[PDB]
Symmetry: none
Subunit: 32 residues, 10 copies
């Protein structure tokens, strides 16, 4: 199991073509 | 299991073509 | 298991073609 | 298991062609 | 297992062609 | 422009996890 | 422009994990 | 421009982990 | 420009870990 | 420009770890 606590994020993605993979600010234990 | 605590992130992705891999600010234990 | 604590990140990715690999600020125990 | 504590990172990737490998600020125990 | 403590990093990657290997600021116990 | 003429193909894909890239018998001028 | 003429292909892919790159029998002028 | 003529291919890929690069029978002028 | 003519190929890839580079039977003018 | 004519190839790759470079039967004018 897991926990994610206090966080601040402001990301921008301005021009993404064919993302088939991943663009992540914070990726915690994911799969993609 | 896991824990992620206090964090601040401001990333920008301005022009990404065919990301099939990954662009990550903070990747913690993920797969991709 | 794992823990990630206090962090500050401001990364920029301005022009990424075909990332099939990975561009990561902080990669902690991931796979890619 | 593992721990990552207080950190500050500001990286920039301005022009990346075909990264199939990895560009990482701090890589801690990852695979790539 | 492992620990990474207080760190500051500001790297820049301005023009990377076909990195299939790795460009890392701090690589701690990774694989690549 | 282009032309593809007489062809015979019998491919099998038995167990594909997370193909995010491509598995192609014959790839002629594509993108992926 | 281009032409591909008489061809026979029988490929098998039995166990592919995370192909993010490419597995191709015949790749003619593609990108990937 | 280009031409590919009479060809026979029977390749097998039995166990491919994380191909992020390429496994190709015949690669003619591609990118990867 | 280019031409590839009469060819026969039967390759096998039985266990490939993290090919990020390339495994090619016949590579003609490609990039990788 | 270039030409490749009559050829026969039967290669096997039985256990490849982290090829980041290249394993090629016949490499004609490629890059890698």
């Amino acid at each position: 199991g897991y926990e994610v606590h206090h966080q601040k994020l402001v990301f921008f993605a301005e021009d993404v073509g064919s993302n088939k993979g991943a663009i992540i600010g914070l990726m915690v234990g994911g799969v993609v």
